[PDB]
Ligand binder design. Structure first.
Ligand SMILES: Cn1c(=O)c2[nH]cnc2n(C)c1=O
Ligand SMILES: Cn1c(=O)c2[nH]cnc2n(C)c1=O
Ligand SMILES: Cn1c(=O)c2[nH]cnc2n(C)c1=O
Ligand SMILES: Cn1c(=O)c2[nH]cnc2n(C)c1=O
Ligand SMILES: Cn1c(=O)c2[nH]cnc2n(C)c1=O
Ligand code: FES
Ligand code: FES
Ligand code: FES
Ligand code: FES
Ligand code: FES
Ligand SMILES: [Co+2]
Ligand SMILES: [Co+2]
Ligand SMILES: [Co+2]
Ligand SMILES: [Co+2]
Ligand SMILES: [Co+2]
Lengths: 344, 344, 344, 344, 344
């Protein structure tokens, strides 16, 4: 848990709002989720999304097997009722007696945004924010939230797969790139407000389907695991946005979320969903094969790996700064480092 | 067989638009569907939804395994291309030769309405229309189209299940009615424009969930299988509309569609979907147990069965009038028969 | 397993007699069983039930894959024949050679009582007895031995679930308690002859099925894992006895046994079996959810938890006394500690 | 772990040539295989069978999901191509740049012999050879390579099962021996050229099928896991050879190979395959039951266990000599030790 | 059964010799097979392959559940023994009494050829022969018998699929033909000795794999269901032969056999097997979709359908001639009808 501890300071998606509403017939939850190997429960208490450890203080039953009752989450075993702060406010067996001081469960940051539920396990450094999705509140764009997809691969390896262009000719030859353009350009990369920003111009006139988001690629990557990709498409001259983020469920699993938005929206959502699913099915077996799950020091990079080289370097900086404490981590995350000629 | 020929003259839903778009990665279809034991294929050819028999004129392959190409449907076997009228316009093996006169497949009236695809197999009487859904184009109402649900029961038995309230205390005691209000009123029923119209007032103060659409019930039933139920709810003083229609797939199977609309729409869609699904799960085993599948003459009615009795009577009249021809059928369907004091 | 070693000194049930007879077509076993993570084999050799380690001394094959031949258990691999004392008496490959003195397997106390097979792994303290079942040899009572039921929960958590008053309202609302009677009395508890003894008069006039054993509850709990509950039922004024005992199979699993006896026995055994199975089905998901599997020090008790508080206290004293040896253990188990006004 | 390092110095079979050719539609591989817990990939690169670690040096994808291209193995992820020495010779993303010095993967000695693929993980002692199969290149004999069979048992326990006849009466009574000849002779055993050699004469006139290879048995066992058994059958006066060898896949699993050759070969191959499969099915549950998987020091031998005893002794000597280095190991393996009157 | 009766006069394959030898551990059978909806049993009695109705004369048990005992097939129920002529020669219950005259089962023509077992149900016209396989006894060629493949399609539709070239561009675009050459040539077709003979020159320089049998195509089709295709390949300048034959199992199923032979045989059998299997997997869903299973009179042909038009015409002639009797059928089958300029 040691090398991963710094990840607890970020906001991570754990489920869609849809999944929470479908979990229990009340539409309020509770829903069991797992984040960085922590077993948590999510529920809607009044107007608030809450996240607690999925473990009752009394006899350790799972609260995720319980029931929302107005402004309370009720344990299924002996009916202890927890408020939005994780504090027990009713012990039905002793309704007069004072409630023990220890009758509380851990309560974590939990917020809805973009149709996903986000949890931050450690808020002590008070310097991380929910990742940036550029299409939110853009009335020009129709937004579709896909169903989550689970991979037997880590969030770091998934991020590197999503931002890697040298693999398109070998993994996506029918679908995203010609098999003949295996040589990608080396682009400037900027750190700004805790995001990696970089821009690409993919090759034109490739034998790829019209629904393929191929064009001018503008990445805004909220560290550590979210990618916002704005595509000015060549084929249609219209904006298409991909927002992909991985939930690090445990040491070898990710629950992954894709939200996409498009300016030309008279067509079928399922044209795009089927295409995204095909791309993911092409990536999945190769990424799941990578072993060990966490990239060892012995991996051999080439110059075309600039994006993942720079990604790994920043992650190591954040892990090092975490050991040094709050101010060092804030600096490592939010200090600007500009390579390009743009102004922010 | 013979008993069911008259049903070919009505419009029946065969799939949702969502089902069509999901069937094939192109989002255009084709999709195989079955209606009154006919194997059909639906596809979006240009701006039109087209229904054809699912059987190529060349060597009888299923066109539903083929592909939409431009505004035509291409057979998977030797690539014959069919236009919106079912006529073959390209024989790839014989590009110069004249296309055989009989190179064509049967085409059927096919329209989208309310997010469903409707097919009329026999248009020769030309007096039937797509059923009425009251909530379409009412901006006060949020509309949800559920996924279809399949039952091993006929469309007639499904219709009678949907409009019966005698069964609420026994099939839906927790969910729609109190167990001790089993006695229902007997209301006037009007025939108008091929619809059964009748109005109820279900019992008040019943211990049923708040998401239960219980209140004053106004039915508009487009013969033979569609029900439009407008509820002015007691618990929320808000309009809730249920539109239920059965596809008669064959002699013992229905593919059933529910669309629901609601005025108070700040809550979760899945609160309502979960409730509807629970109601359907309560009905399903009992309706599927009814045998023989078609109601025989030996069933014993009581006065509380008025809706069922009058429905069976009208269906019998429609079946007999169909044998007398187009004009007799038009009168049996569209002549008014008013029982209530309502103006028309 | 250092902290479970004291449990080896008690008698634990490992199967029903029916299970042993059904295991092999001979009706004599062998049957593989597991107790405290020890792999054992049970068989009927002549008139005796025998238990040995399930591991042949020769080449370590499982004797449970072998065959009973009258008064011998024969290994499946090279046919070594073990007698009722675990000693090899025939090496078929060397019929004239003397049998090595090492050719023996560990043999454990094994006795039938009440239709179960009991094993005691360590008889050195010579102060433990098979648990008490009050209905044995009471000719007024019809006895039913249920099939065993397996839970992913420990024997301690199962015992505490069975004797807990406060969960009935939340886990068993339809079946054992009204949801309104959540506040239990705090009763005197006596230690006598290695049993916990306590009485509880459950609430009257509860909307609960008539086959529910609800009434005046008299518990005789043979430590560590057996519960004998005599119910003088309110609804029928007749005696109903529940005898529940958990086999600690390993650190996270129990094989549980229920025997029940009843004075009014003209009804169906399966009326009561189905009721017991419904109660167990209501408990099972919540008990299996408790984590960690062993109750840790951080659990928060309230005054209504008296029974489980006192149970945990006695188990801890037995564990500590086992470290101090035979006499200290005998005193911790068998010394009386009287809280009530009763005489024994 | 440490206990098994000496086994890396021997040649072990990992697949049949048939398995390699079936793995990929090209018939060239690649095929993933596992040997002593190492994940390897085998492919036919030009005229050579090559074994590499199944892990690309770039980003650790499995080369076994890749493709043979010319005389190289191409990774599925970014198309790096590895030559027969494990060196990367093409980085498609950086065609002009120099290939990193560390762009290479470990390669292992790999040869085809007898229709199997053999791998030696550690070649530094350079004193081991591929096991001896007597029937290779004997045109009097028809050879059949069976499909591999997997057992949840170690290669040591499998070897001892194959060379034991004490068990025939109990495991194979219908098939290999009479049940009442359980007493076997004790024969001289010779060590010569890294092989155990010993000769038997099984009992005559036994009620076993004609396809049973029962007769005069001559064993040549190439240490540690290969057995060559030449049978001069009693029933047919014809030579029958069984070659059995176990791949030690990991600490508890074997992938086992049987090749059999016969002089009288006008009958069906499947008469013999069915018989061998029946024998293996009789052994399998008993051998898989042996626990712990590795034989501990507490097993009790009898004089009939001579073959097993001498096998364990030699393995112990090889393990100890390996710790002393290459010369000590060569002597322990290849020094002769003659017990019989046979000339060498 | 009426329109299919003429097919009983031909020899049909029912299993491979391998399948017969694998069916029972004796390697002699019996094996149940089904041909033209007849339930038959195949067994090897001495040197003879025999086929009988799979139904004992005594109490109608299946002989396929029985045992070969030298020159007899023994029923499993009461052990009646049938000789190679289907006559019972032993009634174990009455070993002295005369055997009833009716104690016989129907016996059918049954012969091995090319590694397949062939059955002819009706030999009364004495004019049909086992189909021609050109590669048999050609020492230049290596022969591989594939495992049978089952399709939900009739033998007529399978034959037409195999000899159809207009479908390659749509069903086999990667594998057998360019998608751009959809236009096939019209070739002369000869009837000779009950075979259709015709020759094709497929297009050259197509983007197809090297193991694809593409070249000069010489067909010899033994009516009604066997195709012998000799390919003088363009890519390798070497002979490749495909022998495909369908067993008409019942009215909607075929059990299909592929044997292939090749002159250049230093490569892997599985290169070719995998390619054939890919081709079959491409055909299978489209052919299984064709409905009704038997081609109706309403199918619309084009000039490129010459082969199947001529096939259907000959089949109709054979069906008509069958009604007229033995001499008419012999003439329809064996009279020559020459279109080309070759001499036979
Ligand atoms: C990584 N990735 C994707 O996963 C994807 N899915 C659909 N377009 C996509 N694009 C353009 C992309 O770059
Ligand atoms: C038949 N029926 C239903 O199936 C249903 N489902 C949800 N409300 C429902 N109501 C009010 C109803 O009358
Ligand atoms: C724990 N428990 C049970 O498990 C049970 N099962 C049936 N009656 C029961 N009673 C009264 C009970 O207390
Ligand atoms: C161990 N073993 C076998 O596994 C076997 N299988 C077939 N004959 C066999 N024989 C003679 C044999 O000794
Ligand atoms: C029909 N057919 C096949 O099924 C086939 N399979 C492999 N080559 C093939 N060829 C050349 C072919 O014509
Ligand atoms: S375990 Fe939650 S209330 Fe007791
Ligand atoms: S079957 Fe449709 S094109 Fe031939
Ligand atoms: S392992 Fe039991 S007799 Fe050998
Ligand atoms: S992981 Fe193999 S080429 Fe990149
Ligand atoms: S049924 Fe065959 S012998 Fe009696
Ligand atoms: Co990718
Ligand atoms: Co209902
Ligand atoms: Co309970
Ligand atoms: Co054996
Ligand atoms: Co084909």
């Amino acid at each position: 848990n040691d090398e991963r501890e710094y990840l607890r300071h970020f906001w991570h998606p754990v489920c869609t709002v849809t999944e929470l509403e479908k979990a229990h017939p009340s539409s309020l939850g509770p829903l069991a989720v797992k984040l960085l190997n922590e077993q948590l429960v999510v529920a809607k208490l009044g107007d608030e999304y809450v996240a607690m450890r999925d473990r009752c203080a009394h006899r350790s039953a799972k609260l995720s097997l319980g029931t929302v009752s107005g402004n309370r989450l009720q344990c299924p075993y002996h009916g202890w009722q927890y408020d939005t702060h994780g504090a027990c406010q009713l012990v039905p067996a002793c309704p007069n007696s004072p409630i023990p001081n220890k009758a509380k469960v851990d309560r974590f940051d939990c917020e809805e945004r973009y149709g996903l539920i986000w949890i931050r396990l450690d808020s002590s450094f008070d310097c991380t924010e929910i990742p940036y999705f550029s299409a939110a509140n853009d009335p020009r764009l129709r937004i579709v939230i896909q169903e989550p997809y689970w991979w037997d691969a880590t969030a770091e390896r998934r991020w590197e797969n999503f931002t890697d262009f040298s693999h398109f000719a070998f993994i996506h030859p029918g679908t995203l790139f010609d098999p003949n353009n295996a040589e990608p350009p080396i682009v400037p990369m900027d750190r700004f407000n805790g995001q990696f920003r970089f821009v690409y111009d993919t090759p034109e006139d490739m034998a790829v389907p019209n629904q393929a988001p191929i064009g001018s690629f503008s990445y805004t990557c909220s560290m550590p695991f979210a990618i916002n990709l704005e595509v000015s498409k060549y084929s249609s001259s219209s904006l298409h946005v991909l927002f992909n983020v991985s939930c690090p469920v445990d040491s070898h699993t990710t629950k992954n979320f894709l939200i996409f938005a498009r300016e030309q929206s008279d067509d079928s959502d399922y044209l795009h969903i089927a295409f995204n699913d095909l791309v993911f099915a092409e990536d999945k077996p190769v990424i799941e094969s990578q072993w060990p799950k966490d990239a060892p020091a012995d991996e051999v990079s080439v110059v075309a790996d600039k994006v993942s080289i720079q990604y790994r370097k920043w992650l190591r900086e954040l892990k090092e700064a975490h050991k040094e404490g709050s101010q060092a981590f804030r600096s490592a995350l939010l200090d600007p480092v500009i390579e390009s000629d743009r102004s922010y």
